Amino acid sequence: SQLDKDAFEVLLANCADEPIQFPGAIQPHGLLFTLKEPELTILQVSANVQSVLGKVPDQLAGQTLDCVLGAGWAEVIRSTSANDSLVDVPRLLMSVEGVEFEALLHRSQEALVLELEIQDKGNMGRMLRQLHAAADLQTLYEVSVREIQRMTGYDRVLIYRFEEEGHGQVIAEASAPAMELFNGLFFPASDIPEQARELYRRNWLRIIPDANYTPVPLVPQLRPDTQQQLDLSFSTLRSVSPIHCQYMKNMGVLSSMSVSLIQGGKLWGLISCGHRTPLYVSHELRSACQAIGQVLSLQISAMEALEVSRQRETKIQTLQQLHQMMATSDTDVFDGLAQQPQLLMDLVGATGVAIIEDRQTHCYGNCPEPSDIRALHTWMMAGGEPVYASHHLSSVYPPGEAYQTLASGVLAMSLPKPVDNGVIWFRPEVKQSVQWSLRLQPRTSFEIWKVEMTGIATKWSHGDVFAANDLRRSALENDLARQVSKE
Amino acid sequence: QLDKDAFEVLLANCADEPIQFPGAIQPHGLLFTLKEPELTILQVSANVQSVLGKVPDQLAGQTLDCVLGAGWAEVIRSTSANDSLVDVPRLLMSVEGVEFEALLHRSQEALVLELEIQDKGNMGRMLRQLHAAADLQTLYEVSVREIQRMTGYDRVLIYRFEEEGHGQVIAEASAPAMELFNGLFFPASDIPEQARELYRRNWLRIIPDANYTPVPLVPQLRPDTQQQLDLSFSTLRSVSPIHCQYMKNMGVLSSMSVSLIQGGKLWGLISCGHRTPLYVSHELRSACQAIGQVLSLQISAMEALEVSRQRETKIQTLQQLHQMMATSDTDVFDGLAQQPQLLMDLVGATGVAIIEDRQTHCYGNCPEPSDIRALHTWMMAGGEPVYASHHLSSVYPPGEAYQTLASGVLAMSLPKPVDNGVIWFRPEVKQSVQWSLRLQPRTSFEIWKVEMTGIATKWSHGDVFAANDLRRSALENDLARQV
Numbered sequence: 017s018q019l020d021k022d023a024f025e026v027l028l029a030n031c032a033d034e035p036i037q038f039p040g041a042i043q044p045h046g047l048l049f050t051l052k053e054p055e056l057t058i059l060q061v062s063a064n065v066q067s068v069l070g071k072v073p074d075q076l077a078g079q080t081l082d083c084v085l086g087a088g089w090a091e092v093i094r095s096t097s098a099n100d101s102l103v104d105v106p107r108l109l110m111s112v113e114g115v116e117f118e119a120l121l122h123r124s125q126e127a128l129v130l131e132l133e134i135q136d137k138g139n140m141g142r143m144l145r146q147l148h149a150a151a152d153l154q155t156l157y158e159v160s161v162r163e164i165q166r167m168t169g170y171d172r173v174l175i176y177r178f179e180e181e182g183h184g185q186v187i188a189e190a191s192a193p194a195m196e197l198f199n200g201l202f203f204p205a206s207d208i209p210e211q212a213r214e215l216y217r218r219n220w221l222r223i224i225p226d227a228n229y230t231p232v233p234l235v236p237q238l239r240p241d242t243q244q245q246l247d248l249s250f251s252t253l254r255s256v257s258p259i260h261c262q263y264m265k266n267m268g269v270l271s272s273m274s275v276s277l278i279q280g281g282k283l284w285g286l287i288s289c290g291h292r293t294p295l296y297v298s299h300e301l302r303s304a305c306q307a308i309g310q311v312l313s314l315q316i317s318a319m320e321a322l323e324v325s326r327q328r329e330t331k332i333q334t335l336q337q338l339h340q341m342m343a344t345s346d347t348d349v350f351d352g353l354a355q356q357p358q359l360l361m362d363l364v365g366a367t368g369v370a371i372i373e374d375r376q377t378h379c380y381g382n383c384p385e386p387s388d389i390r391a392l393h394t395w396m397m398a399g400g401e402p403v404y405a406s407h408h409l410s411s412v413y414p415p416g417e418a419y420q421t422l423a424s425g426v427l428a429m430s431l432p433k434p435v436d437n438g439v440i441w442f443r444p445e446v447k448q449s450v451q452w453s454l455r456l457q458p459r460t461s462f463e464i465w466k467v468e469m470t471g472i473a474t475k476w477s478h479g480d481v482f483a484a485n486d487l488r489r490s491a492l493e494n495d496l497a498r499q500v501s502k503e
Numbered sequence: 504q505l506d507k508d509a510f511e512v513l514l515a516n517c518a519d520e521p522i523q524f525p526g527a528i529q530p531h532g533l534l535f536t537l538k539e540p541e542l543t544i545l546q547v548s549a550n551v552q553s554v555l556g557k558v559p560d561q562l563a564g565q566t567l568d569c570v571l572g573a574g575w576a577e578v579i580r581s582t583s584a585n586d587s588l589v590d591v592p593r594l595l596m597s598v599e600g601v602e603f604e605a606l607l608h609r610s611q612e613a614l615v616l617e618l619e620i621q622d623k624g625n626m627g628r629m630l631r632q633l634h635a636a637a638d639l640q641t642l643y644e645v646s647v648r649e650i651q652r653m654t655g656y657d658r659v660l661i662y663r664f665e666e667e668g669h670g671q672v673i674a675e676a677s678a679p680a681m682e683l684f685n686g687l688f689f690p691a692s693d694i695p696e697q698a699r700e701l702y703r704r705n706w707l708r709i710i711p712d713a714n715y716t717p718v719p720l721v722p723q724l725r726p727d728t729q730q731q732l733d734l735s736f737s738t739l740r741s742v743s744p745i746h747c748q749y750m751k752n753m754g755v756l757s758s759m760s761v762s763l764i765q766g767g768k769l770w771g772l773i774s775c776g777h778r779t780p781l782y783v784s785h786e787l788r789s790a791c792q793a794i795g796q797v798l799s800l801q802i803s804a805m806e807a808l809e810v811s812r813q814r815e816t817k818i819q820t821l822q823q824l825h826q827m828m829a830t831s832d833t834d835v836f837d838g839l840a841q842q843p844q845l846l847m848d849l850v851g852a853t854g855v856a857i858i859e860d861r862q863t864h865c866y867g868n869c870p871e872p873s874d875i876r877a878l879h880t881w882m883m884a885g886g887e888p889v890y891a892s893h894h895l896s897s898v899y900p901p902g903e904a905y906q907t908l909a910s911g912v913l914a915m916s917l918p919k920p921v922d923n924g925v926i927w928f929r930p931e932v933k934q935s936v937q938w939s940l941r942l943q944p945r946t947s948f949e950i951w952k953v954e955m956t957g958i959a960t961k962w963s964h965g966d967v968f969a970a971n972d973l974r975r976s977a978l979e980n981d982l983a984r985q986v
């Protein structure tokens with residue numbers, strides 16, 4: 017397939033803007049019918065109508081819904097399709113021509129999308145009990161992944177967390193014995209395109225029962241009512257892009273089932289379940305996984321909130337100690353800050369605390385050569401404000417590349433005293449605290465992350481900047497009186 | 504006559520009743536306590552003859568095989584070996600015909616086994632429903648409606664514990680032809696502290712019949728330790744007759760309470776009352792426990808967001824007010840005096856009181872400028888730049904003159920010998936609540952009214968933050984305009 021490889025390589029270059037929401041084909045484990053809400057006439061049909069029902073698709077475009085689905089169920093789907101929210105709808109199991117079909121309903125731009133999924137072949141209280149029993153966030157991730165693996169029966173279960181600029185991190189992983197391990201792996205934001213992220217934000221479950229699937233087209237590809245393509249954003253039977261199918265092939269997973277974790281409308285992460293054999297997931301399993309996803313999304317938000325509030329709680333305690341730390345014979349407040357560096361390091365969070373004063377420089381922790389530090393302090397005038405924050409110093413100050421491991425994100429405060437002053441913080445690179453062991457591959461994904469996240473340190477959160485601007489006022493209140501009170 | 508007097512004497516010790524050590528259990532099951540190494544019947548319940556029809560006198564210390572049979576004894580011996588009695592599946596058995604569900608726990612180095620009687624998919628839908636809720640009141644209404652539908656209880660109420668442990672019926676769904684309780688604040692004395700500790704320890708409390716005769720635990724003292732068995736973690740525990748009388752006077756004969764615990768603190772309760780006795784199966788109890796846990800997680804989620812959401816809008820109006828004073832230099836708070844609502848909404852208030860000498864400037868609630876002088880004259884004894892009041896009727900002896908107008912007063916006054924001051928008010932909680940013999944919801948409301956006489960809602964930690972965040976702003980901005 018030399019021609020196909022060239023055609024595929026075209027998709028690889030143009031993958032950040034492919035029309036995922038408008039594939040024009042569905043996965044072949046069911047049927048899709050687009051209908052009209054008032055009369056329920058078959059507006060669009062799938063190519064499997066002859067495969068599972070044995071009806072020629074040419075005579076379906078427009079004609080009666082009774083023709084293929086039977087008049088018996090037509091009234092049922094009319095009644096369940098009456099003017100309603102359709103948000104909460106009970107299960108609707110059917111059987112036409114001896115084929116078991118589960119009917120799911122939604123609406124897309126004044127159309128009734130009917131998804132006839134094919135059918136082949138108590139513990140909840142326990143799962144929520146264990147989820148509540150978790151103490152810390154890492155324990156919560158571990159127990160959640162273990163429980164999802166146990167109940168689903170999926171070979172691999174992974175929790176991706178989207179940290180910064182869309183980059184991902186595999187936090188918790190449980191896998192079947194003797195199979196590839198992914199933990200501490202960081203993948204770039206380019207791996208998941210933005211359209212896929214929007215769909216994951218608008219859908220709880222994404223099921224790909226078989227990567228070796230041939231897409232079946234929707235005939236006709238154009239809806240006569242609007243003369244466009246179907247928006248399959250909310251359809252469970254939506255074709256997967258060949259790029260992700262190749263990615264799953266290279267991984268070794270043939271069936272996937274992703275559960276989205278949404279906090280405050282933002283995609284916190286994903287729960288990805290992979291199988292080495294094509295696995296078909298029943299409705300009960302889907303509902304249980306959705307329930308665990310929502311419960312964990314609620315719980316994760318709570319655990320960080322307690323931890324975020326805890327950091328604020330131990331912040332003001334840290335400043336209070338520091339606000340009185342210079343109570344004894346301080347030549348400068350900074351020289352009083354030189355007694356115990358770890359209080360400064362723990363105030364804002366950084367491996368390097370350096371305060372330059374008295375024609376010399378005082379640094380504790382991960383710091384560069386002192387001569388170049390004043391050159392970084394020579395850049396203080398460029399800020400124009402005591403506060404300074406950066407998650408990437410190389411991009412904003414070009415000669416700050418010699419020290420990327422020691423100083424990638426620098427927090428600073430400088431009192432307006434013109435002679436010699438300023439406080440400097442040093443946070444190391446993210447690349448120096450990450451450990452893990454073809455184009456579309458997890459190993460290749462890690463290398464792109466190490467080049468995309470170059471010289472980038474973890475962003476100083478609003479609390480750290482608040483704890484930074486706080487000492488700006490505290491040092492200004494005290495330092496001037498210290499010299500004045502001597503006189 | 505004699506029995507009625509014994510009831511009143513019991514009402515004296517309702518505050519410090521030994522609930523954890525009743526010495527009897529509800530008659531809808533059996534209780535045994537056993538030694539872990541041997542599994543011998545250390546202490547038994549009096550209702551053995553009721554179901555098993557066996558003498559109890561030769562059971563204190565004997566082997567379990569004579570009561571529960573050899574096979575079931577071995578099964579529970581294997582179950583109790585090292586399972587830690589946490590996350591243990593259902594263990595239904597049947598001795599002498601009667602089916603018993605065997606729940607297990609351990610108390611002070613003893614193995615308590617409860618044989619509860621056996622009389623007579625939607626969870627995902629309810630979790631989706633609770634996630635779909637947008638506001639807090641919508642969340643409470645949805646939770647109560649779904650809980651009532653799933654459990655089939657005539658009354659389902661959610662109590663929120665506010666201020667000094669007082670109660671508030673936040674949401675309520677009830678069957679027709681039943682008294683309505685909404686906004687019915689009740690005192691903290693209605694639920695004693697021991698009951699609150701037990702509700703914190705146990706998710707579920709089930710009283711299937713208020714008209715029950717307790718079965719005593721014989722012998723009443725464990726020979727191993729010579730004390731009363733602690734039933735603080737057992738579903739089969741006798742309830743105090745005070746609560747039984749309260750439930751009879753309410754008009755409920757069966758109760759099913761799920762405790763909402765946020766961060767180890769009893770946020771509230773989900774009380775399910777029935778007009779007739781009712782028994783809840785294990786599946787129903789597990790489902791209600793799961794919904795309670797989900798709602799406890801979700802209440803904290805929306806509470807935390809609104810705590811932060813109020814902080815973002817606190818700074819938003821904070822910048823606007825501290826940049827306004829640049830327009831007017833006649834008074835340091837003249838710009839503060841142009842938008843009174845931007846001052847009331849800054850911290851939560853129904854009246855702004857900013858006044859210097861020879862001036863009277865208060866918008867909204869204000870008793871009298873002459874009393875405002877006396878209101879401004881309180882600070883001689885308690886003098887700080889930021890002063891707050893949770894109950895002004897106590898700290899200020901003439902706090903009862905204006906309680907509906909100013910019950911909790913938050914005050915900032917910059918340090919200047921010349922007259923100054925910024926003060927905001929807050930009215931009574933008792934003047935914003937409305938609702939329609941000794942142990943009765945009607946009586947409970949009038950006790951709360953007396954117990955809250957001039958008590959305003961506590962100034963939040965973010966509320967005193969906006970008081971100190973306006974301490975620095977008015978301090979620095981004053982000199983530049985004067986200069």
Ligand SMILES: *C/C=C1/C(=C/c2[nH]c(/C=C3[NH+]=C(/C=C4/NC(=O)C(C=C)=C4C)C(C)=C\3CCC(=O)O)c(CCC(=O)O)c2C)NC(=O)[C@H]1C
Nearest residue numbers: 031032198203207208212256257259260274286288458461
């Ligand atoms: C520009 C196009 C590309 C692309 C497309 C693409 N990816 C997904 C889904 C993915 N891909 C993931 C990639 C990974 N990177 C890693 O390091 C690891 C290892 C653990 C993985 C799996 C990934 C995590 C997802 C999300 C899956 C989930 O759990 O939901 C899609 C969406 C497909 C769809 O139809 O929904 C697309 C279009 N992948 C590329 O690699 C680049 C070239």
Ligand SMILES: *C/C=C1/C(=C/c2[nH]c(/C=C3[NH+]=C(/C=C4/NC(=O)C(C=C)=C4C)C(C)=C\3CCC(=O)O)c(CCC(=O)O)c2C)NC(=O)[C@H]1C
Nearest residue numbers: 517518684689692693694698742743745746760772944947
């Ligand atoms: C000092 C003794 C008293 C007391 C004891 C008592 N009460 C409970 C449980 C209660 N009582 C509640 C009271 C209410 N107040 C109201 O306004 C309303 C109506 C809306 C009610 C129902 C109340 C809410 C509870 C908790 C219910 C639950 O089961 O969770 C107990 C606990 C009993 C036990 O064994 O668990 C005790 C000991 N009640 C009094 O009135 C005072 C005199």
